[PDB]
Design a protein around this ligand. Structure first.
Ligand SMILES: [Zn+2]
Lengths: 195, 596
């Protein structure tokens, strides 16, 4: 009768940057989604693959507890088959993804007067991300064919820029915290069913 | 790699860097304006510098990319803007000199004083004082002392400086490849596009001219009516055939003739509609005024205001300690924040003003999606116009009844209608001739048609021929009369005003047709019709992405300015005016002088 530790994840003091995604494997416990199924604080309980209306009777192999914080308008891009900066160079969802995306506004915790500068994102990349992949490289991006030579130069730019969240922004620019619960199931006994 | 490719990456770097620096600058200005303290001034200055530094260095960075190579319209429009290359072209020493001259001139205007000949002690500055005499007094002699005075002291000082300014500016322009400074200014209305949407710099001159010729018959009649009425108040001075003497027209420079309403009311006994008293009776408050406005906008179809607006804006005169700048203003700080600052008192005029200001905000909200460089109105004129259209609708007798301010059974009469129209005309028709003249003089001076020796002579001649006003006292070359007006001495373009007016009416007629109004255009109300809103919205969203000509077409169906709509609005008045002056002479003879 081990309760999966979903709790300590939602109310953590801080979440890492957009490009430094956090992965936790949750296996060999019991997870009950009926706690938040009726509560509904979230603007979106949008789910894909599994219907939230009492489908916890099935068995899954592992649970991924992806978590981060982004801008508001970009919440959409956390959806299958959509292309935008966040999708292109930051986090990816396969079209076939099964699991739940839940998001809420947390301006109050995140926003700081004078700006909060601890959340960052990668503007340009040589190519596109492949599925569920992490790039933490800080090497300078080069657009020019002439060599960058490792210095700031014409057509040479550092990859990451800061969100700079501030209290007086519109609903689109205000910080939104996103948690993606992915139910990974393969050919396995799948002890993580969550009765 | 195409330069197109290189260009697109560059443009992405700039976009995020630009918005954040701008927001900071803006926040600082709001703070100063709301709480005026010395410390605040400092912060504002520091932040502003950073933003400018960014723009300048970036602009310099981008003169490098060839303009011709890019083959997509949107990208091109953006690159062009960053590449404007204004002012930096001049050598540093020259730049420094120009800056000094510009500053000196602004100071003289603000601090200038003029004195009563009769009482040496009394000396008055412009804003508090000289203005009042001009605006409210009815004595011939008094008015004269003031007119001459501003001109004699502030003006004479300004002339030597102006001459230098003309030369330097012209040099700057020549370097940037426009022919003269005038061309640079007309450049704003220039568009290059493919299918018959092209407008050229030269064409503006022709169009303005054509339109004026059409408006002339109305002006002539109005001029006559005023003349006859004025004759009663200052009996000896005015002459039946001749032009109106200048000092008697209602403001120091003559721009608007509105102050003459008391003297000229057509049908005096019936009173104008004012709802101020009622508002007090029903206990409306400042927020109530704003709240009502929102409802109008919602009814047409545009979106409701955001939560932030309600919380952060300063809708009321600040109580207690802070000191506040008073102009009614609308602010788009950026990154989503929209705020309005004004002090509201429960008066009818404020109801009307609120509607205008909110209008400016609604446009802004709409163009947000477009990229940073392109987020602005299509041509300078459009922004103001959008706002005005809204106000006209609100003032109509019908709207006021529905809100409940007016009593239920009021029925207007012919007399009241005429009275309303005249008031409007003095403000709108009266301004148009003046604007045309000023701009023409300036364009010519810059080009070189008028030699320096003859600058003053020409000004007066032109006024007599086009606007029908004559000098009270002879003015020699040393004086520099055009300079006194604020815009002239603070380097701004004055064309925007003529164009805006023509546009407003055009928009209104079109919208009204969709809304199915039947009757005189003066009574049209767009309220409660969704369709109208949608059409306007389509234009608003474009921003500067597409050429101005294209935009006008979407709402009104034509690619060019036309003055037929204005004439229709004022048609009921025209007929009346014609009957009234049937006996009197219409026209002016340039010969008469009050110089005598
Ligand atoms: Zn305005």
């Amino acid at each position: 009768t081990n309760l999966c530790p979903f709790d300590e994840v939602f109310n953590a003091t801080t979440f890492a940057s957009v490009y430094a995604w956090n992965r936790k494997r949750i296996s060999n416990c019991v997870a009950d989604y009926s706690v938040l199924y009726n509560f509904a604080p979230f603007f979106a309980f949008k789910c894909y693959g599994v219907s939230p209306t009492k489908l916890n009777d099935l068995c899954f192999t592992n649970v991924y507890a992806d978590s981060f914080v982004i801008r508001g308008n970009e919440v959409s891009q956390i959806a299958p088959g959509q292309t935008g900066n966040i999708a292109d160079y930051n986090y990816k969802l396969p079209d076939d993804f099964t699991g739940c995306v839940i998001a809420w506004n947390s301006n109050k915790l995140d926003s700081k007067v004078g700006g909060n500068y601890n959340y960052r994102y990668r503007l340009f990349r040589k190519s596109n991300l492949k599925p569920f992949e992490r790039d933490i490289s800080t090497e300078i991006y080069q657009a020019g064919n002439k060599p960058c030579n490792g210095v700031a130069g014409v057509n040479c730019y550092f990859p990451l820029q800061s969100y700079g969240f501030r209290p007086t922004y519109g609903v689109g620019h205000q910080p939104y915290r996103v948690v993606v619960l992915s139910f990974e199931l393969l050919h396995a006994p799948a002890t993580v069913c969550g009765p | 790699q195409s330069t197109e490719d290189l260009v697109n990456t560059f443009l992405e770097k700039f976009n995020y860097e630009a918005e954040e620096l701008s927001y900071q600058s803006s926040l600082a200005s709001w703070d100063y304006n709301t709480n005026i303290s010395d410390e605040n001034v400092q912060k504002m200055n520091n932040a502003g510098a950073k933003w400018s530094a960014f723009y300048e260095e970036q602009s310099k960075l981008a003169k490098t990319y060839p303009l011709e190579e890019i083959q997509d319209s949107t990208v091109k429009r953006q690159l062009r803007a960053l590449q404007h290359s204004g002012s930096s072209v001049l050598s540093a020493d020259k730049n420094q000199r120009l800056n000094t001259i510009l500053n000196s001139m602004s100071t003289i205007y603000s601090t200038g004083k003029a004195c009563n000949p009769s009482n040496p002690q009394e000396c008055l500055l412009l804003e508090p004082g000289l203005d009042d005499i001009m605006e409210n007094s009815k004595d011939y002699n008094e008015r004269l002392w003031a007119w001459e005075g501003w001109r004699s002291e502030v003006g004479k000082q300004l002339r030597p400086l102006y001459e230098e300014y003309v030369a330097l500016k012209n040099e700057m322009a020549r370097a940037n490849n426009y022919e003269d400074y005038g061309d640079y200014w007309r450049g704003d209305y220039e568009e290059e596009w493919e299918n018959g949407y092209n407008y050229s710099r030269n064409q503006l001159i022709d169009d303005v001219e054509h339109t004026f010729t059409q408006i002339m018959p109305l002006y002539q009649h109005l001029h006559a009516y005023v003349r006859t009425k004025l004759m009663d108040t200052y009996p000896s001075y005015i002459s039946p055939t001749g032009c109106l003497p200048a000092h008697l027209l209602g403001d120091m420079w003559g721009r608007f003739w509105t102050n003459l309403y008391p003297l000229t009311v057509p049908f005096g006994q019936k009173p104008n509609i004012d709802v101020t008293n009622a508002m007090v009776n029903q206990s409306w408050d400042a927020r109530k005024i704003f709240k009502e406005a929102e409802k109008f906008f919602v009814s047409v179809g545009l979106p409701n205001m955001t939560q932030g607006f309600w919380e952060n804006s300063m809708l009321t005169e600040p109580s207690d300690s802070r000191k506040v700048v008073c102009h009614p203003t609308a602010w788009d700080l950026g990154k989503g924040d929209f705020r309005i600052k004004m002090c509201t008192k429960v008066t009818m005029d404020d109801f009307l003003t609120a509607h205008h200001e909110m209008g400016h905000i609604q446009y802004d909200m709409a163009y947000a999606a477009q990229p940073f460089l392109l987020r602005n109105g299509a041509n300078e004129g459009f922004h103001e116009a959008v706002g005005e259209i809204m106000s006209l609708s609100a003032a109509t007798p019908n709207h006021l009844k529905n809100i409940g301010l007016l009593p239920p059974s009021f029925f207007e009469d012919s007399e009241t209608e005429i009275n309303f129209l005249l008031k409007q005309a003095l403000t709108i028709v009266g301004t148009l001739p003046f604007t045309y003249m000023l701009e023409k003089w300036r364009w010519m001076v810059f080009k070189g048609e008028i030699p320096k020796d003859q600058w003053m002579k020409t000004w007066w001649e032109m006024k007599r021929n086009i606007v029908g006003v004559v000098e009270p006292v002879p003015h020699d070359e040393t004086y520099c009369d055009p300079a006194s007006l604020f815009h002239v001495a603070n380097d701004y373009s004055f064309i925007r005003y003529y164009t805006r007016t023509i546009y407003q009416f055009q928009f209104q007629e079109a919208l009204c047709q969709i809304a199915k109004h039947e009757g005189p255009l003066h009574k049209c109300d767009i309220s409660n019709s969704s369709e109208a809103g949608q059409k306007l919205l389509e234009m608003l969203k474009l921003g500067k992405s597409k050429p101005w000509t294209y935009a006008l077409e979407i709402v009104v169906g034509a690619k060019n300015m036309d003055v037929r709509p204005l004439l229709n609005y004022f048609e009921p008045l025209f007929t009346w005016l014609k009957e009234q002056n049937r006996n009197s002479f219409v026209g002016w003879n340039t010969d008469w002088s009050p110089y005598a």
